[model samples]
Target: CITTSQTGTHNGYYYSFWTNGGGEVTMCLGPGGEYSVTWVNCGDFTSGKGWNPANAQTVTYSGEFNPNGNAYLAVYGWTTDPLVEYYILESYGTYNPSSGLTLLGQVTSDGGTYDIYSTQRVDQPSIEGTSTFNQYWSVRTEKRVGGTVTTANHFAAWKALGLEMGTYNYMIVSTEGYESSGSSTITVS
Candidate 1:
């Protein structure tokens, strides 16, 4: 387990660990799309590709995931032009992250249904520094571990729901924890 408090490319994929709280997090990158993370009440730990949608991505994964607070297994990324943050939540923790967000509608993809949501972040920290941006969500109703995320489907759904996305920065299979603690051992393709 090569652990670091850094953000870089590993095994042809992009992995990052970010936190605003005083908690600690350690992420170990394995070969391929494999990695494990354990955080002591911290923020997000993720591994995914660093490029944009050059082709349709059919990401597949499987493993053990456990989170005591808010966790998300999603195809997550940021975009430019309008600067939008997006999440295609495939699995989550105890609370529904979008419990109070505006429900645009719902979309079905792969083998499950997901609730679509959009919200605004007023002057929040983002990949482009401290700035305000829109967040687009496709939160899966049924939370489960290990499955396929046909990202194009969610993209289409978000577009159809009137959630316009901007230029893509990068999108990857990510696991996020919000002021919480958790651990996960997972792999992707």
Candidate 2:
């Protein structure tokens, strides 16, 4: 049987699909390390894997990424208390995710270099409801389909660069398609 969902928790993983204006999204996840998704142009959408209540641990991931239009293949998540959103970008399509962020040097992690960026959003929607928050980003200088993202490396770099995060929330490898279309088959360990 084929199963689809907007939000749910599987074996040590979290899967979600969310749209802002309106879009069609379908997600099917199996246990710990497998998932797939497809979406169409309508407004904006973000979906894929998440480690609910993540621990800033190392993540080894690989996947097939097929995206058309503006899409982001990334490590996406948020924090509470301080209400921070963060991304460790592995790949993207059509748009550079770091377009608006302020560059804050670079860091080498999981065998590659990533340009660090940070920004603050006022009165923005967040996991803790509508509120102000900051965003931390690590945009890889060289993009690829999948690799191990030692999240703690990024976290340490963020701290060194002065990007603070509150209590840990959920972290996952996710894809964001904006007024776009794409599909992904991902496996994580």
Candidate 3:
């Protein structure tokens, strides 16, 4: 089973991840404002979620991770009802298809490289809205390894391509693993 919550700063605001079955993980958001997450025995997982202004021209993020299995850092968002949809502003790491998604193309940004994908969700129930959305995914091909990875330039690049990313609802810095086993650590600011 998989579960998540906003019980702490790291989980509710800055950085977090999800584990299926059972795992050993420790997460901390320092009073000094540093965010950290560590996990072991994690079967499959997804991590990170944050929010930004709906009309912000561009959003910026910085983070680092030590991945022992498959992992990625991504900026994702969604639109409101009537035209409810999900969008991926950027992503970096391993790429895997999620069943109904279709490949769009590959794009490069000053931040790094990405493979784009799209999907329409009519069956998956919306978490906070009235209907499912047309989801867009920007999966980054490069591994984080170490050091800071930023996204302002990537956002600008996407805008130049005339990508119609709808109103932003939330931004997520996440990692997803498929039947994966191992430990990983992530830090964000």
Candidate 4:
């Protein structure tokens, strides 16, 4: 099954949700772009944000999952205007970053070690803007053993390294699959 917000602008924001299979996902973005997308699926889920503005010093995401197949919980951010900059943060179950992603460094937080990556493209064309700029990404090398993940320290760590946390125009969280089958459950709060 799939569910999503209609295509169009709402209160100055263009947004939508897309999903496939029995697993479910939900997303919420505040006036300052503070947001969360949580899902459980054996398929794929996608979300888009257009022109939603928000500011957050730190954010936290947590979930429980049983992956019958490869799965991941991830986030994306982009700036407004022609040079739409982008950012990413994700925790994985059986996926890895490749290609354009460049290794920046590593940090240990909350008893977990995270490898940070930066790139220049959005994972998919789900957002409606085009330009060139750098993007920041962090992937927890260790699989999600189950618990809450906070961005407070991670954000600070990146900021020290010339990372830009400019005015955000969009953000998304999703669980993507390739040759995914079987069943999986997820809960985010």
Candidate 5:
């Protein structure tokens, strides 16, 4: 499983690819971000010119205030048997490592309250640090009150967590909460 959190800087894209088999995968992102996702079948990668959104999904996260402030996008597929393989292609932004697209020891899962981008020279998105196998994460907003809650239904609690007090949306792609794939939206005010 994998997850992520938001950074102060904007990222144009965030992508990942896989091979061999396909199963359920969930993707979630932030209040102010959007992404395009695609799934290529075994032959699609070799075909080169046969990849498109028709074989992909373009999902948009909502800015609604949710205490359970997370939104989800789930994709279900063959879990056990399959003769074909699949690959995931995700490109979030135009990343230039020389112009600050390189950072070391960056967090890449779960959620946090600090200004995530501050630790990196590049504009890579912020992911959590405590993540292990069977877990994942994505970017998050800063709510400066009431500590923090994974599933928020009201903004007041997040507001009290010293989150720096702002609005945000976040998403992820993994089996963090289940064996299925899906996405979630988070709004902080």
Candidate 6:
């Protein structure tokens, strides 16, 4: 089974229809918001018929609107014929700015079918329960089955997003997509 969201929920396991094609499954809960995607799969699946979430892929998106608004999860299939299913999750909640999170857009379909991307919103509250004690703020990408991470320099990504350095501000955190683990911590002066 592969875990795509941070809820520690196993959406579903891979069901292959021969080595030529297989389907990837995932689960998510709404009110929809922005989320980073990190995939995880058992290393024992057979080629073409199973999932290998360890396979990392990078995706670039463009839009004036916040990329994390109304974001949701999706699944894709690999075969001679590739298909994208958008917002396939069962429940998608309303978008609430007060919650400190928003659902960006989803990018499940692309020119190539080898990779999939889902946009999500993450706000201050989502990461607030964690501890922050040092002069640095640690942020992590979305959690995956293998505990993978897509970014370590959370501060850098925040700065790049045009957020001025201040006492406390909100930003998105992620790992580089190749790591098999994820974690975040902060130091306060």
Question: Pick by lDDT: which candidate is best?
Answer: 2
Shift of residue 80 alpha carbon in model 5, Å: 29
Clashing pairs in 4: 32-54, 32-55, 33-54
The lDDT per prediction is: 0.76, 0.80, 0.49, 0.49, 0.22, 0.21
TM-score-based ranking: 2, 1, 3, 4, 5, 6
Residue 108 of model 3: what lDDT? 68
Better of 2 and 4 by TM-score: 2
Q: Which segments of candidate 4 are over 4 A away from where they belong? A: 4-44, 47-54, 57-61, 66-70, 81-90, 98-100, 122-126, 130-133, 170-173, 178-186
- In angstroms, what RMSD does candidate 3 have relative to the true structure? 5.0
For model 3, what is the alpha-carbon lDDT of residue 146? 34
How much is the lDDT of residue 159 in candidate 5? 28
Q: Model 5, 68-132: lDDT tens per residue?
A: 11222221111111111111111111221123312111221123431121111133212222221
Of models 3 and 6, which has the larger lDDT? 3
Residue 70 lDDT in candidate 1: 76
Q: Name the candidate that leads on TM-score.
A: 2
Q: In model 3, what is the error at residue 24, expressed in angstroms? A: 4.5
Superior by TM-score: candidate 1 or candidate 3: 1
The Cα error of candidate 1 at residue 93, in Å, is 1.4
For model 4, how does the per-residue alpha-carbon lDDT over 10-100 read when each residue is reduced to its tens digit? 4455454555444555555444323344455535654544334534323344443434455555544555443343333354445565445
Task: Output the lDDT of residue 168, model 1.
Answer: 75
lDDT of 3 by residue, 1-189 (tens): 115433334433544344544565445454322445566656655655455433432444455555565544455445554344443434333335533666566666545676666666776534464466666656556544333334444444455654456555545455454433433334334
Stretches of candidate 3 above 4 Å error? 1-4, 7-26, 31-33, 40-45, 52-64, 82-95, 98-101, 129-131, 145-164
Models 1 onward score TM values of: 0.89, 0.91, 0.60, 0.58, 0.18, 0.17
**Segments in model 6 whose C-alpha atoms lie over 4 Å from true places:** 1-57, 60-92, 97-130, 133-157, 162-189
Ranking by lDDT: 2, 1, 4, 3, 5, 6
